[PDB]
Ligand binder design. Structure first.
Ligand SMILES: [Mg+2]
Lengths: 33, 97, 100, 95, 100, 96
């Protein structure tokens, strides 16, 4: 199936460098609430 | 069958949009997907394996039935390819010289 | 009755701003949504108010609502698109500022 | 106020000490945290651009700010410095 | 009396690392902070140790403490800023690597 | 070891099957998790003292012995260094 463990967990979403995000930091570690 | 606000993942970029926006153009690819078995990502958002940067414009065309390109956009041919994949005939002609 | 801090979701980009900022410009689109008492707006799964527009361009729309002015980044490649977003939200003065 | 202040600036979450916010008298952050609106999680809320607050917060710490190499938003950061009323930081940003 | 794995909060960015890693550089600021000589150090709402510094750049500080070297991203705009963080944490050799 | 091991890498929690960690013989994670010291956090999760974000692509390699990265990956050099720590010889070759 298209939805399967190895298939589902492959699709990791990350923030593409669109506009300001291209030059502003996005990854520093885990977020705090 | 679908919520009012749909969670989309296009090439790794998360997008939120109304269900009405996806079906705004009948007989289109996005219309065929969400018209009353789909692919979903790790977090449960519907997944589209296409260019994440170019999907912004494609999604805006569904909103307004028109699209303003960025200033000095020389990748129009590339945006045309995405328009063909999503099956938006009128947008393809707007991008075709 | 609205909270002092409004949680917005614009096209998948989450923004926080004060209720006073949304109604800062009368007769605007955001003013219509947040000014009267309603019993109806569109919200996502987490309860955040949803605007079905480009989330990245909302950064500059929201900054205009705060200051009635907007400094763009150096070499901003989407001045023309931001004007279209300003027109949708019905901000006449901001559209004027963006027209050369 | 606690020793570690939990801030929410326009949707960007920042932690800093209470002493850091009030380090510069008669600035806006000084007026706010000198003996308020809070978000859903109880964090103190600043209604400004969250991405630029990182450089405002770095100024309060060191009284100087090294910007990234080709930082496209010096003019925008100056506007944030003016809002928070940081005269010396505004001086550093004008040529 | 610190645990083997320390929970760090740097400007709102949460970090986990081994306690031995924090004292890897003698006479450094992190050396002065976590050297047993643990309830007096400032903590956040959840009890995690708090560092009042830039959270995004601290990611690369921990790689230096681990490896005695730091591979930066292919395109990096903040080498000068990281050097300032290295100076604050008192890492002389890391400042040398970042100074051209 | 349980069927699903809970790992803490630099503060980022990951869930994975024991079989994935031991998929590559003579690897660092293989030496750690081969049924035959370890450090756990406050919640009893095994701790790896490395950068948490880059472990995502190392974990995809351990599963499939392959990794398709995005077209604009800004930290190829760092992932090469992280692969070196976990001792994945074929993966480091792929990035060179
Ligand atoms: Mg794989």
């Amino acid at each position: 199936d298209i939805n399967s463990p190895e298939h589902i967990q492959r699709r990791l979403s990350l923030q593409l460098p669109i506009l300001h995000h291209a030059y502003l930091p996005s990854i520093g570690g885990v977020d705090a609430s | 069958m679908f919520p009012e606000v749909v969670e989309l993942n296009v090439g790794g970029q998360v997008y939120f949009t109304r269900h009405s926006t996806l079906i705004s153009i009948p007989h289109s690819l996005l219309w065929k997907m969400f018209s009353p078995d789909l692919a979903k990502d790790s977090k449960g958002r519907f997944f589209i394996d296409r260019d994440g940067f170019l999907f912004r414009y494609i999604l805006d065309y569904l909103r307004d039935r028109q699209v303003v390109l960025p200033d000095h956009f020389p990748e129009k041919g590339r945006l045309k390819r995405e328009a063909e994949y999503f099956q938006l005939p009128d947008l393809v002609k707007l991008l075709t010289p």
